[PDB]
Amino acid sequence: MEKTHVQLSLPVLQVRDVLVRGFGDSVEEVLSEARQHLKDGTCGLVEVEKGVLPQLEQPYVFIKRSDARTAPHGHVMVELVAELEGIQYGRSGETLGVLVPHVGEIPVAYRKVLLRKN
Numbered sequence: 245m246e247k248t249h250v251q252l253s254l255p256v257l258q259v260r261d262v263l264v265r266g267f268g269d270s271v272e273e274v275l276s277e278a279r280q281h282l283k284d285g286t287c288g289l290v291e292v293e294k295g296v297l298p299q300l301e302q303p304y305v306f307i308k309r310s311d312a313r314t315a316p317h318g319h320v321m322v323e324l325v326a327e328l329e330g331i332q333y334g335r336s337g338e339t340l341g342v343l344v345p346h347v348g349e350i351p352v353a354y355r356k357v358l359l360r361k362n
């Protein structure tokens with residue numbers, strides 16, 4: 245009974261502030277955990293720049309843009325894609341950032357997305 249998409253406002257974290265630097269130890273686990281933390285409001289976003297991914301833990305969970313129209317209410321439509329050892333699980337659009345657990349770090353901005361749950 246989950247609606248297919250949910251509007252979320254994600255805290256954007258600087259990489260050196262992140263305390264828990266990934267969601268788990270396999271592709272399937274990190275996708276599962278990321279979805280749980282999104283549902284619970286305990287998921288942050290790190291914008292990818294040079295130096296960022298080597299300071300985070302693989303497998304990575306990205307949010308990627310899933311369509312070019314719409315963006316209803318200022319929320320870019322996105323979906324989850326995981327990466328391990330240079331192989332991606334999912335194909336989608338441009339990366340908005342890498343998801344990490346949020347455990348109370350102070351963000352620098354909030355990023356509004358319309359997330360495809362599955």
Ligand SMILES: CNCc1csc(-c2cccc(Cl)c2)n1
Nearest residue numbers: 246250252279282283284285361
């Ligand atoms: C505070 N977030 C709002 C919310 C409500 S239901 C929900 C959700 C349910 C299943 C999978 C995912 Cl990825 C998200 N998120």
